[PDB]
Amino acid sequence: DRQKSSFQTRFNVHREVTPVELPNCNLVKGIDNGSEDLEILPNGLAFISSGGKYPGIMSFDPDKSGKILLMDLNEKEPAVSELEIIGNTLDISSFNPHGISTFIDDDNTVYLLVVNRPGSSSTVEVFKFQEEEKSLLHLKTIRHKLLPSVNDIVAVGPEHFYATNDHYFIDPYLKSWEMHLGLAWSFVTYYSPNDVRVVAEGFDSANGINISPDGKYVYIAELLAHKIHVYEKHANWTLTPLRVLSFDTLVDNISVDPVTGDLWVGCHPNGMRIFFYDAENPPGSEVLRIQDILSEEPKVTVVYAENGTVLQGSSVAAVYKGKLLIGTVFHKALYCDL
């Protein structure tokens, strides 16, 4: 079949991980049920989305709740704490976080945007971060017909963001059929209070999304195409294609380093192991650094790679002052000397 061929191309089924080691990597105590996305502020506080659940993805603790965790990366051996969500505008029993993003106001108010999928429906929750009290003040729940199945967002103001949708459909049965057939109907939305538009479409599962430090480019990961799309971001928020980068791995969430502009990318080398879990054959981990992404030949380095004997299912990676923090879809988190 032509379909069985493109299926085992999309899920990269023949792929094995040549190890790339780091000598001082330590599992973060307290993270056992996922750390699928994370973001580090310029002051070294890192937010971690944890406990999220997906229909069909593995879970070691099904009654576990979704949590936003805090980590101070300026500490020597940093520990995670669960952030308290306060407010009355949000149903916490169904809180099921996925991608996250931050925005820092001119007053230095910190806003956290959190992709929420309570049930089959999909929202974006915006919180105010209260560092002293170590809490998240809920502000708003954002819902839209152009946000059917949000995977990750990148904030550009307190309720302004680009959002990936990893499926066109909302219903989980059609969702898996969509994903199995490879329709590639997932798309990217710009959301703002006064204006909500599709800015790109035709993606075979758009996952991570991020922005360059100067605002001029947007990066979008296409999981099952193994591609990172680079877009020019215009003053009217529309996007025009620029580069497409290709890899031998499923690219998941994208972090951008503020100083260099470098991309750090959490990857699933073999899509079968991450989608059809099997304890005797667990998914591995791979972290990519991407430099000089606008130039003729961009520099791609594998900074860390492993078959899962330590860390299973890396989905996000970010660096801070010599340290590398790696998160997983549903497993642990690895803190590493670079």
* Residue 313 binds Ca ion, judged by CB under 5 A: no
Write down the least CB distance from residue 100 to Ca ion, Å. Answer: 5
Beta strands 314-320 and 299-306, pairing class: unpaired
Residue 236: which of Ca ion, Cl ion, none does it interact with, CB under 5 to 8 A by kind?
Answer: none
Residue number with CB closer to Ca ion (2 or 213): 213
Q: Which residue pairs from 226-230 have beta carbons closer than 8 angstroms and sit at least 24 positions apart in sequence?
A: 226/12, 226/250, 226/251, 227/251, 228/254, 228/263, 228/265, 228/290, 229/200, 230/293, 230/294
* Residue 331 binds Cl ion, judged by CB under 5 A: no
CA 84, chain centre distance (Å): 22
The dihedrals phi and psi of 195, each to the nearest 5 degrees, come to -170, 120
CA pair distance 310, 315, nearest whole angstrom: 14
Residue 273: which of Cl ion, Ca ion, none does it interact with, CB under 5 to 8 A by kind?
Answer: Cl ion
| Residue selected from 34, 78, 118, 269 as contacting Cl ion according to rule CB under 5 A | 269
Short-list 286, 287, 284, CA closest to 274: 284
| Residue selected from 32, 125, 152, 178 as contacting Ca ion according to rule CB under 5 A | 152
Nearest residue to the partner Cl ion, using Cβ = 284
26-45 residues near Ca ion, rule: CB under 5 A: 37
| Residue selected from 270, 312, 315, 328 as contacting Cl ion according to rule CB under 5 A | 270
Total residues in contact with Ca ion, by rule CB under 5 A: 4
Q: Which two tokens stand for residue 316?
A: 């996000």
- Reported as half-sphere exposure (CB side, CA atoms, 13 A), residue 54 has a value of 22
* Residue 13 binds Cl ion, judged by CB under 5 A: no
Catalytic residue among 98, 138, 226, 229: 98
* Residue 99 binds Ca ion, judged by CB under 5 A: yes
Residue number with CB closer to Cl ion (66 or 283): 283
Partners of 170 in beta bridges: none
CA pair distance 329, 252, nearest whole angstrom: 10
Q: Count CB neighbours of 93 within 10 A.
A: 6
Strands, sheet with 195-203, edge to edge from the N-terminal-most edge strand: 150-157, 160-165, 186-192, 195-203
Short-list 132, 135, 50, 139, CA closest to 95: 50
Question: Is 98 designated active site?
Answer: yes
Which listed range, 47-55, 266-274, 312-320, 322-330, lies at the site for Cl ion (CB under 5 A)? 266-274
* Residue 32 binds Cl ion, judged by CB under 5 A: no
Binding letters toward Ca ion, positions 54-93, x by CB under 5 A: ----------------------------------------
* Residue 306 binds Ca ion, judged by CB under 5 A: no
| Residues belonging to the active site | 98
Site residues for Ca ion per CB under 5 A? 37, 99, 101, 152
Site residues for Cl ion per CB under 5 A? 19, 269-270, 273, 283-284, 292, 294-295, 306-307
